[PDB]
Amino acid sequence: QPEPDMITIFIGTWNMGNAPPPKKITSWFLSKGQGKTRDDSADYIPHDIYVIGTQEDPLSEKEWLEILKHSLQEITSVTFKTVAIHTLWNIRIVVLAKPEHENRISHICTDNVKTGIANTLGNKGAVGVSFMFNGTSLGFVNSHLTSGSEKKLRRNQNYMNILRFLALGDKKLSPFNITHRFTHLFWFGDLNYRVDLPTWEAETIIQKIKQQQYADLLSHDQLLTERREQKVFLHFEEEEITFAPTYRFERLTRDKYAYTKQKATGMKYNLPSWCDRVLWKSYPLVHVVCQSYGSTSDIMTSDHSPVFATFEAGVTSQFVSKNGPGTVDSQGQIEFLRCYATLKTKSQTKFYLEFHSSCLESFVKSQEGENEEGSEGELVVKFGETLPKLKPIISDPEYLLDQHILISIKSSDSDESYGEGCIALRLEATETQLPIYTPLTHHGELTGHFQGEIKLQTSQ
């Protein structure tokens, strides 16, 4: 039975509005409704992994698991295994997998982050799950961010707190947050970004939605505009939105948007908005293709419609050779030439690099670089030809060209990371000097760049 080189992943996000679901929710898991929808000919084909994020979920874990498992069994005739379930208040994540995958999955982690302070601590935050699927690390975050059209900055703050403090994946990757720990990271939820147009334009917006003319609305979507100004979700992707806004509906129909201010809304308008989103970030040159992104039309218990996204995602096998794991394979090496970091920091300390990768027995510390002043004010840290030669555990190119090297640039004075990035070993050539590049981030904000050349030796 061969190990897969691809799997499909279903991501669902639904703010349930504190109401039980209707008796049938299969349209959600089938990616049917509005937007980029799944072909009917695929309906019986199970996804490999289903990740369900809910917000304002009134159900017990048991109650929701029974609904989810029975739904998938009706669609696929497969009884899915429960990988993980984690709930913070009314924010929940469930991971289900085909039974054939049970012994491909390991290192299952769950965590949560509560956002805000005092007033603003008590119902917003995130839950997440991570695990290994054979040689591939997968992370999943379901976040319910701060509500309200005039709180985009708070949402951006909520995002940074979640990616700093959610403790998922390999704890040995100590300098790296969740935005660097996974081959594929999926972040979804009620992100609560709104269409920023005047209140007086509410009926105009509704008109535009009835015409399926989303362009002038999406140009005011706060998540798109904040992401274009590099304020949030830097280096994440989102599929084009081709479905109507998923909030705020009158319950038990989808014919009416309920946008007017009410005591129940704290006298706030809720103009139609794309609150409910799915984004991802995968390591460079790993296969990931969005195959659906849309909303259901037939699930109407909530003031939100469910959102679905499906993905093809490249995966690798748990590689064994006669040498590694448990030793190095002297036929393999990774060399770095003419490397330098450019940092935005105003500080003057010495810097060194750490190289982290599951192709190494453990992480590698470099010598300190040489600081110079850049022509436009910047700190340039030069490593020249001084970087250590990295000794991978396995030299086979079928393994090594699929791996990645995480880089942290750290202060010698404090040992704190000033920037993190990732280099793919999926090179155009081996035994050949080739350009490499990564942006560097810290707390998910841009802090610099790392560039240079790589020379990869494999057993071929």
Q: Residues in the site for ligand O0P, rule: CB under 6 A?
A: 81-83, 97, 101-102, 105-106, 108
Question: Exposed e or buried b for every residue in 392-421, given b needs 16+ CB within 10 A?
Answer: bbbbbbebbbbbbbbbbbbeeeeeebbbbb
Nearer to ligand O0P, 101 or 181 (CB): 101
Nearer to ligand O0P, 10 or 193 (CB): 10
Minimal distance in Å, beta carbon 1 to ligand O0P?
A: 16
CB-based closest residue to ligand O0P: 81
- Measured from the Cβ of residue 167, the count of other Cβ atoms closer than 10 Å reads 15
Structure tokens at 76: 């696929």
Nearer to ligand O0P, 81 or 220 (CB): 81
Long-range pairs for 114-121 at CB < 8 Å and ≥24 separation? 114/88, 115/145, 115/146, 115/157, 115/158, 115/161, 115/162, 116/146, 116/154, 116/158, 120/146, 120/154
d(CA 90, CA 226): 27
Question: Which residues face 451 on adjacent strands?
Answer: 340, 437
Nearer to ligand O0P, 95 or 244 (CB): 95
Structure tokens at 38: 């799944």
- Measured from the Cβ of residue 102, the count of other Cβ atoms closer than 10 Å reads 10
Minimal distance in Å, beta carbon 131 to ligand O0P?
A: 7
Minimal distance in Å, beta carbon 70 to ligand O0P?
A: 17
Nearer to ligand O0P, 97 or 241 (CB): 97
Query: Is 96 within 8 Å of 276 (Cβ atoms)?
Result: no
Question: Exposed e or buried b for every residue in 11-35, given b needs 16+ CB within 10 A?
Answer: bbbbbbbebebeeebebbbbbbbbb
Minimal distance in Å, beta carbon 97 to ligand O0P?
A: 4
Minimal distance in Å, beta carbon 99 to ligand O0P?
A: 7
Query: Is 109 within 8 Å of 169 (Cβ atoms)?
Result: yes
Minimal distance in Å, beta carbon 81 to ligand O0P?
A: 3
Minimal distance in Å, beta carbon 98 to ligand O0P?
A: 8
Scan for tokens 């698991």, then name that residue: 65
Q: Looking at residue 273, what DSSP letter applies? A: B
Minimal distance in Å, beta carbon 384 to ligand O0P?
A: 44
Residue 53's identity, in one-letter code, is: G
- Beta-carbon-side half-sphere exposure of residue 459 (alpha carbons within 13 Å): 14
Minimal distance in Å, beta carbon 130 to ligand O0P?
A: 12
State the virtual CA torsion across 422, 425, 430, 432 in degrees, nearest 10: -10
**Segment (H or E) for 206:** helix 202-210
Read off φ and ψ for residue 446, nearest 5 degrees.
-65, 125
Nearer to ligand O0P, 3 or 398 (CB): 3
Minimal distance in Å, beta carbon 393 to ligand O0P?
A: 21
Scan for tokens 């982690």, then name that residue: 109
Nearer to ligand O0P, 97 or 162 (CB): 97
d(CA 350, CA 367): 10
Question: Which residues face 186 on adjacent strands?
Answer: 140, 280
Minimal distance in Å, beta carbon 51 to ligand O0P?
A: 13
Question: Which residues face 371 on adjacent strands?
Answer: 381
- CA 446 centroid distance within chain: 17
Nearer to ligand O0P, 11 or 96 (CB): 96
Nearer to ligand O0P, 81 or 164 (CB): 81
Nearer to ligand O0P, 182 or 193 (CB): 182
Report helix, strand or coil for 217.
helix
Determine if residue 268 is left, alpha or beta; phi over 0 gives left, psi from -120 to 50 gives alpha, anything else beta.
Answer: beta
Minimal distance in Å, beta carbon 41 to ligand O0P?
A: 27
Nearer to ligand O0P, 4 or 332 (CB): 4
Q: Looking at residue 241, what DSSP letter applies? A: P
Nearer to ligand O0P, 101 or 152 (CB): 101
